[PDB]
């Protein structure tokens, strides 16, 4: 599924991103159109073998299992494939894991290099939330 920006800020805020670890709406709606450009279904092999799945790009060594990432953790307790469906509640719920592990949104390089330090709040204008 490929969402709209104020029906993926809607769908995060029900979720409870909004503010979650001190992270407004409008970072996780860039870091998403950064990461995926609001594709569920974006997947992105990395050169350590590892692969980045959905909305918000959730590495494969760490945070879910693909059954291709050796010596790879599974700290959301899911299958990979979980992450690319057209409901974010896997991805919302595992990204809430990720953003609580010490480094904050820097943990998505895509947010850290293209939202941080920007006007995010850009991203909700105009969305009734
Ligand atoms: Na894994």
């Known amino acids: 599924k490929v969402f709209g920006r104020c029906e993926l800020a809607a769908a995060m805020k029900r979720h409870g991103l909004d503010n979650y670890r001190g992270y407004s709406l409008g970072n996780w709606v860039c870091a998403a159109k950064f990461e995926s450009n609001f594709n569920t279904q974006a997947t992105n092999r990395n050169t350590d073998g590892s692969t980045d799945y959905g909305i918000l ?73």
């Open 57 to 129: 790009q959730i590495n494969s060594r760490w945070w879910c299992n693909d059954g291709r990432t050796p010596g790879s953790r599974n700290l959301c307790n899911i299958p990979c494939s979980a992450l690319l469906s057209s409901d974010i509640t896997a991805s919302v719920n595992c990204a809430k894991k990720i953003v609580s592990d010490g480094n904050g949104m820097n943990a998505w390089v895509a947010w850290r290099n293209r939202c941080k330090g920007t006007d995010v709040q850009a991203w909700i204008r105009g969305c009734r939330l």
